[PDB]
RNA sequence: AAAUUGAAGAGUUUGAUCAUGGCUCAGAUUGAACGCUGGCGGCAGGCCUAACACAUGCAAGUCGAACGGUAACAGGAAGAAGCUUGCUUCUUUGCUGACGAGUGGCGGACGGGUGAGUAAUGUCUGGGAAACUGCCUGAUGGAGGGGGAUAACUACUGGAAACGGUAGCUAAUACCGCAUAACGUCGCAAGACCAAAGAGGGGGACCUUCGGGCCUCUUGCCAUCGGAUGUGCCCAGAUGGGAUUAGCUAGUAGGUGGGGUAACGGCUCACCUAGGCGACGAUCCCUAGCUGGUCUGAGAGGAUGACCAGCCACACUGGAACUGAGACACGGUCCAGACUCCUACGGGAGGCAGCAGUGGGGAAUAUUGCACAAUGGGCGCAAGCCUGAUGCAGCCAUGCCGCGUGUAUGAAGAAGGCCUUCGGGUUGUAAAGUACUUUCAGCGGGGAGGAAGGGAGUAAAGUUAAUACCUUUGCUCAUUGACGUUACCCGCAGAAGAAGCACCGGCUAACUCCGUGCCAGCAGCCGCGGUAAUACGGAGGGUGCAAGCGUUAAUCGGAAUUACUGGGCGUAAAGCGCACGCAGGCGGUUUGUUAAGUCAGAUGUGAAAUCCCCGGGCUCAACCUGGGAACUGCAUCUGAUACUGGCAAGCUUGAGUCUCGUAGAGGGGGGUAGAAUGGAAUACCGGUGGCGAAGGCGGCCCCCUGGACGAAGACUGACGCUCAGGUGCGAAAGCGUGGGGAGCAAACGGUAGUCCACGCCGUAAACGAUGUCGACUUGGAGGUUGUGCCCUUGAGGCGUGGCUUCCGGAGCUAACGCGUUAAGUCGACCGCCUGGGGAGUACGGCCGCAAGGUUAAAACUCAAAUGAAUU
């Protein structure tokens, strides 16, 4: 039900005195399809133990996203520190159109067409951290609707 | 700056009701006479490279109020260039 | 850069030159050649590459590289030059292209061979 | 209905004529700034009746000159 | 100097956003009345207050939702740099609906909504979401 | 044009079948269709994301006997629809007269149906049809020559056809020699294990 | 020179120029006349000359000549210096 | 028109001139359209350091209004008077009163 | 002077004209004024392949422009059938 | 109802991270070329290069119903006849059809080529008046009467030829008069003036000198007003780069008068004035035919103008004008220049950037084909002729699309090859075998359509005298095809005649085995190869395409790497060293006014094409084709007035003005006091403490003050901010002039030097590595200068302006870090940046005596250089 994927793997290395010990991370990022998405970053000796540990940490913390029927709710821009990230919610059956590290966390989201485009670098962990705070400060009709004290009617 | 004596026999020949020290027929005279008074002194030893600036801003300042002048209310302004002999 | 700087002068556009002068905008000139030797490569690369000085035909000189196993290319032979840059080698930008009007193709070869002109085999 | 045209004056050296000047309002194209420009016209003149900073009313008519075609109908703001 | 006043009153109220503020407190003018109109209406704050007779100020009574950000999302577009105008059909769609974006029209100042429901466009002045 | 090599290891290179022959028998009764194609038929790599998605266009594309320009054409048309890609893209890779006749079960194999077809044995209101490509259009009748009837291999084709599944949305008619495309499939009328947004990604890159 | 028709052209051409060159120097003459008559400052002898000379420029702008256009000009020139004096 | 406060400190050998070069400076002040609110006369008094002779000198203290000119003529004034050892003048700085 | 001709515009062995009116000085493909119809000569059966627009020849006509044999023709067949 | 549905990254600097930043690749496309192969068909395309020179052949003629006539041709007549008594065979007759050459009319200004020049004279969009217009079509009238020449021709004759010359001779719709006369031209009017031609068909009555007159219709001619088409002209906007191109321009700008154009106008001339354009980029220099469009792109944009269509320019080079409605003339003329060719050595002929083709350049682009059967164009009543326009054929896989090289069964899992754990696996239903089929080429039959027309004969109506003649409207009859051995259908036979290319380390879909040992070699990046190389060569296998595959070249995409949408400038590239101020940009709040911008609506236009979506026609598609909409544009009208724009009147909080005082290392010149060795620095106050737009500012007095500060009070009314050039100030260093020069110290104790005046230089880490001005923001701990309230109830507690120093919240920051004096949230303006080296270098230009300073490249070379932070 939790769906999960590695993005990425990279051979990490802290010198010794003596020398290199080859230390490997990994992020991987868990969903079930809806609302409902927690991403974990992974550091350890081995691929198994990177993947497990990122596991772990992304059994917690639930990222709970604003989604429509199977697609955005409305454009939405983000950036963290390292890059930005736009998206926009495209018509049904279009693909899932995304660029390499943001296809994984857009596929496990569970929306399947969605328009995306990311300017600037393309380091994994800031650009997937950025979709994923562009994602969660979305928003829904009815949520705008309760703050604005008015109806999904009156704002359509 | 300038005696009190001589900026209120200014404001009192120059100025079209009492105590308007700030209307621009008062302002541009006091600045004048001021001006006169200082070309005495720069007129010596050529060197005051500092007092200058407040030289040339008072010459900007006159300069703008008499542009606000042409660009406002011209009668006043062309019937005070010839009590001081304005624009050489 | 607002907008004011922009109407006063608009943006600076900066044009990319090619790589490649000597064809003229072409994909392939004949050149004649002039001098025929080999010279070594740069670290970490250990060979004689062969090389030669081609003149073309709009008064251009530019070296030139053959590629394959063996060749007899002696001076006077015109050949054709496509074109393709090669790190080893300090600035050529200039292949000879085997099997053109006066280039044997390379001899004892199955695979690839459109690259150096060998026939079909019966 | 009369199409006509207004603007300053620049100029009127030479008799029977003025060199007008007309400030159109175009929005530019590449970057979508209001910018004004301003175009001259030679304007043909009688009995030299304006001078300089003054504003006209002129309309179009067939050329007169080398390089003047226009001619002036009336006059607004008449003051200098 | 403010040259913009609409754009200190937009970001006053950014500013007043982020401090956790519930009144601030900005001198006032019909365009900004009009602004505060189409911003209360819209259900962004509580009420508006033009307090003073020779040198009035505004006060505005900014709403909380569970004590967030009710409106974050304000930035001026026709600034005095350059004049943006729309036509009717033209006319933007802040996040598909869920913003609002002010115009000035010959019928006064008025919605978005509203104004391409009347059929006719006019200037931006701002961005609300 | 015509793939004309070994055909069952494009199945193996595949993992399942493709109802590419006959059918007489089973698939494995002559293949060892889980074991892969080639010398090396003992690794399984994770096929990547592009790797998965070339395999899918390739197993579409030799499903239907299609190569890469007249597929590229196909899925061009088919985004230039309104609406969903993959089942307007089916639904005009279905389309094709020889696959038409083929579930119809004229033919034992496309081959076969596309030999048939392409020797002037098939007939749309009655004018003859050589073009292998042709789309049929929605209520359309077609039939077969009376010339090539007295062919073995139609009997043939025909008793196994009334073996294999029936379609719905195909009006056929065994012993009129003839049938008619009711309307055009649908999305359910497919075999689920064809996925589409795999192929609509891929091309649109 | 290449075609028939051209060297008939060309004989063609030179005959009318040869007549069109006699018959614009006749009117020339004729209208130096009249000029030569104003410019004198006569009021009689040069109202004569252009009454005689307006048939001859009429009939060769009427026989293709010259358009209408040029003859109504010369007789508005010569009728305005005519009523000068 | 600006006050100032001049002071001077004589030789002692000359103590008995100031008589009258104080009565000569109050006429030319009076003359010259100035006030004399405060005269003072300390007497001798030791230095800070024997300036110019042994440690003895006389004070006497003028605080005159009168204009800068008349003031300015006394510095030269004491240029040619070589009887004076020290001069040393302020401005007005509210100027003082009684000595106390 | 003016004319309604026919222009060329199909494939090899498959022609289709389109009657317009032009100068007569210009060649086939020219430029030309205004557009009539169409005449389609490889028509099948009961196709839409002879098209006029009547009350403009007679207005082009009426200035005084010429007419062709073609279009003459076709115009004849037009108003004999209904 | 549809006219849309649209954005992918990966690798690469470090021992390891992030960021900026350069580089490479994944995609599409082409007028493409090359290499290896190559079955067919349909539709398109095919000298971009030397606007280099052309052999040769064809590309503009037609009219006998405008003319004299007869060089041939064939048809009549009259006689000569050989007697064959009508017949073969001769001479004559323009007599007939027809027609060489010639006069004349029309047509060579259409159609067709190429882009040399051509940054405005040209092109596009939208307007305007001061014009003409043969052939086309309406309206109104005439269409009378004469004259002289000449071509061809005859004779003679010059010249090598072309080409002429002399004397006679005849025609008209050729030429020239007279009459002719308006609604035309000229003149306010009165008044004057202006043109022509007949031809063909027949025929009742007369008529006749034998031709005809006469009737009729058809057609032609002249004059005027029209319509339409086309062309000429003017204006407004837009239409490349270089300011390392700052002034240009006397027919120059304007005015008067004369000439000339179809038409206004310095178009031109004489005179008078001295103006006109230019920072919103004039001149100059370098390049380009422009547009609908084409490709790419999510869009904005970027590149470009190959076919097709619209407009402009040119015809060997430079000029000129004639004819003509229209040329400043592609297959016309004249002059000058070159080239080639001919010559009898005096003189002549020509211009393929037309259709083919030849030579040369090139890597490169084709047949010295057929036909006017179609649609056009010219001529003519018509028939009819020309048409290298055009319609089709020939070559090229150059581009797009379609079909075929078999189908089913078939494990003895054949043989062989390859790998191998030597058991076997792989090739592999693949092969062989069995059964079935004949699409396309090949063979032979049939066989649509592009074809509508015109011709011969007849009926009806129109027209008369006519039931002739002519015009239409019907009918009847032979017919009118280069394509074309057509597309297509039918029968023949036989698996038959019909597949290659690239790749296999990662980017990216695919792996093993032999040779080779940093050698040969491979390679778009990383880079591999020093005896087990998955990267080189070879073998099998696999992968991706397909009659094509691959390489190269070029344009866009990723490239957000020009960032207006959509980049920055504290440490990586960048805030001018600093002020004043012109131009320019922006601008507080209220009322009133206008309505330019703006918005809404309407009208006109935005050619046809192309793209889009609905359909149709080619057995489908390509292709063609019927509707719309777009053509995001421009112009005229009406209305709206929130905003700006223009104006009028205002207001004080912005800006300032005055008063009281304050602290003042603020600057110049004139004096004074000491310590040490006549000059110089004024040590102890002195402090992340004060003064200044700024470098910088320091013992004590006289002047100008300038700025800032606190206090309330009095005043103007938006007087403001920034500011390219421009001016001024200007650490230091370097000098020039006149000096000296205690100590000092490049060079040689010790020069100049620091200092005194006049000038220059304009340079710094001129740094706060932070341009200026403003509005809004959790605090704490200080120095500093300030006044008040109340009891100063001793420097008193509170708050208040500043200037100024550290921690530090939100926030921003690649990290460090900043954080009410932001590098936070925003506005206004101006500067600078697009990888590193070459190099702030050359070439200039400008300023300076000079040193020097400012602006400021490319060629070339590399694939990295560059910041923080830890291990």
Request: net charge positive; charged share 30%.
């Amino acid at each position: 039900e939790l769906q999960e994927k590695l993005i990425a793997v990279n051979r990490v290395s802290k010198t010794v005195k003596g020398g290199r010990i080859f230390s490997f991370t990994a992020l991987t990022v868990v969903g079930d399809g809806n609302g409902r998405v927690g991403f974990g970053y992974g550091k350890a000796r081995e691929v198994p133990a990177a993947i497990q540990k990122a596991m772990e940490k992304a059994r917690r913390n639930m990222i709970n996203v604003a989604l429509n029927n199977g697609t955005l709710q409305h454009p939405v821009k983000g950036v963290h520190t390292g890059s930005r990230v736009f998206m926009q919610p495209a018509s049904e059956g279009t693909g899932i159109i995304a660029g390499g590290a943001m296809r994984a966390v857009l596929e496990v989201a569970g929306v399947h067409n969605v328009l995306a485009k990311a300017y600037g670098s393309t380091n994994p962990i800031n650009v997937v951290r950025a979709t994923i705070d562009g994602l969660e400060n979305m928003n829904s009709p009815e949520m705008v609707a309760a703050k604005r004290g008015k109806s999904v009617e009156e704002i359509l | 700056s300038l005696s009190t004596e001589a900026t209120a026999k200014i404001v009192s020949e120059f100025g079209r009701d009492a105590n308007d020290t700030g209307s621009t027929e008062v302002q541009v005279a006091l600045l004048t006479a001021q001006i006169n008074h200082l070309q005495g002194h720069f007129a010596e030893h050529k060197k005051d490279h500092h007092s200058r600036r407040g030289l040339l801003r008072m010459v900007s300042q006159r300069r703008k109020l008499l542009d606000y002048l042409k660009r406002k209310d011209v009668a006043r302004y062309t019937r005070l260039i010839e009590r001081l002999g304005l624009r050489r | 850069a607002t907008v004011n700087q922009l109407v006063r002068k608009p943006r600076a556009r900066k044009v990319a030159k090619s790589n490649v002068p000597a064809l003229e905008a072409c994909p392939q000139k004949r050149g004649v050649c002039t001098r025929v030797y080999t010279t070594t490569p740069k670290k970490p690369n250990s060979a004689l590459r062969k090389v030669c000085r081609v003149r073309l035909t709009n008064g251009f000189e530019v070296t030139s590289y053959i590629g394959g196993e063996g060749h007899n290319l002696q001076e006077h032979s015109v050949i054709l030059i496509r074109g393709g840059r090669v790190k080893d080698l300090p600035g050529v930008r200039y292949h000879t292209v085997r099997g053109a009007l006066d280039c044997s193709g390379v001899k004892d070869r199955k695979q690839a061979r459109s690259k150096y002109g060998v026939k079909r085999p019966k | 209905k009369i199409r006509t045209l207004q603007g300053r004056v620049v100029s009127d050296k030479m008799e029977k004529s003025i060199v007008v000047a007309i400030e159109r309002f175009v929005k530019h194209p590449i970057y979508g700034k209001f910018i004004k420009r301003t175009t001259k016209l030679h304007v043909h003149d009688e009995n030299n009746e304006c001078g300089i900073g003054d504003v006209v009313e002129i309309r179009e008519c067939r050329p007169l000159s080398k390089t003047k075609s226009w001619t002036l109908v009336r006059v607004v703001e008449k003051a200098v | 100097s403010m040259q913009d006043p609409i754009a200190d009153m937009l970001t006053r109220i950014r500013n007043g956003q982020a401090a956790n503020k519930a009144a601030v407190t900005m001198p006032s003018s019909k365009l900004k009345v009009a602004i505060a109109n189409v911003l209360k209406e819209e259900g962004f704050i509580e009420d508006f207050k033009v307090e003073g007779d020779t040198k009035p100020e505004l006060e505005l009574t900014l709403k909380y939702f569970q004590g967030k950000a009710v409106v974050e999302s304000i930035q001026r577009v026709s600034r005095p740099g350059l004049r943006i105008y729309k036509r009717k059909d033209e006319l933007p769609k802040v996040m598909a609906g869920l913003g609002i974006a002010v115009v000035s029209t010959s019928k006064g100042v008025m919605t978005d909504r509203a104004a391409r429901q009347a059929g006719l466009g006019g200037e931006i002045i701002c961005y609300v979401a | 044009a015509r793939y004309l090599g070994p055909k069952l290891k494009l199945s193996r290179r595949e993992g399942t079948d493709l109802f590419l022959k006959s059918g007489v028998r089973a698939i494995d009764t002559k293949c060892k269709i889980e074991q892969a194609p080639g010398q090396h038929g003992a690794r399984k790599p994770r096929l990547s994301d592009y790797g998965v998605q070339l395999r899918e266009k390739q197993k579409v594309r030799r499903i239907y006997g299609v190569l890469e320009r007249q597929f590229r054409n196909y899925y061009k048309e088919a985004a230039r629809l309104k609406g969903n890609t993959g089942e307007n893209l089916l639904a005009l890779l279905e389309g094709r007269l020889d696959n038409v006749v083929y579930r119809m079960g004229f033919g034992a194999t496309r081959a076969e149906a596309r030999q048939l077809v392409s020797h002037k044995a098939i007939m749309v209101n009655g004018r003859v049809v050589n073009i292998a490509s042709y789309q049929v259009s929605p209520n359309d009748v077609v039939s077969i020559r009376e010339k090539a009837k007295k062919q073995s291999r139609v009997k043939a084709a025909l008793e196994l056809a009334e073996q294999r599944e029936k379609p719905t949305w195909l009006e056929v008619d065994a012993g009129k020699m003839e049938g008619t495309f009711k309307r055009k499939p649908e999305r359910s009328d497919l075999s689920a294990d064809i996925n589409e947004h795999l192929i609509v990604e891929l091309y649109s890159k | 020179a290449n075609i028939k028709s051209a060297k008939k052209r060309a004989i063609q051409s030179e005959k009318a120029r040869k007549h069109n060159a006699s018959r614009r120097s006749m009117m020339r003459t004729f209208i130096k006349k009249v000029y030569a008559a104003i410019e004198a400052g006569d009021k009689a002898a040069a109202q004569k000359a252009f009454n005689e000379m307006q048939p001859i420029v009429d009939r060769q702008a009427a026989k293709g000549l010259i358009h209408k256009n040029k003859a109504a000009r010369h007789k508005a020139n010569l009728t305005a210096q005519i009523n000068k004096l | 028109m600006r006050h100032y406060e001049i002071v001077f400190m004589v030789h002692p050998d000359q103590s008995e001139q100031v008589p009258g070069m104080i009565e000569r400076y109050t006429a030319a002040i009076t003359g010259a359209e100035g006030k004399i609110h405060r005269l003072e006369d300390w007497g001798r008094r030791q230095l800070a350091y024997p300036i110019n002779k042994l440690h003895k000198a006389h004070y006497v203290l003028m605080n005159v209004e009168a204009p800068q000119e008349v003031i300015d003529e006394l510095e030269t004034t004491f240029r040619f008077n070589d009887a004076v050892i020290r001069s040393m003048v302020m401005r007005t700085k509210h100027a003082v009163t009684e000595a106390s | 002077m003016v004319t309604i001709r026919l222009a060329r515009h199909g494939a090899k062995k498959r022609p289709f004209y389109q009657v317009v009116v032009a100068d007569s000085r210009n060649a086939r493909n020219g430029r030309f004024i205004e557009r009539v119809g169409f005449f389609n000569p490889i028509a099948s059966e009961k196709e839409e392949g002879t098209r006029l627009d009547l009350d403009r020849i007679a207005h082009w006509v009426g200035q005084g422009a010429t007419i062709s044999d073609r279009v003459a023709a076709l115009i004849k067949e037009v108003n004999k059938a209904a």
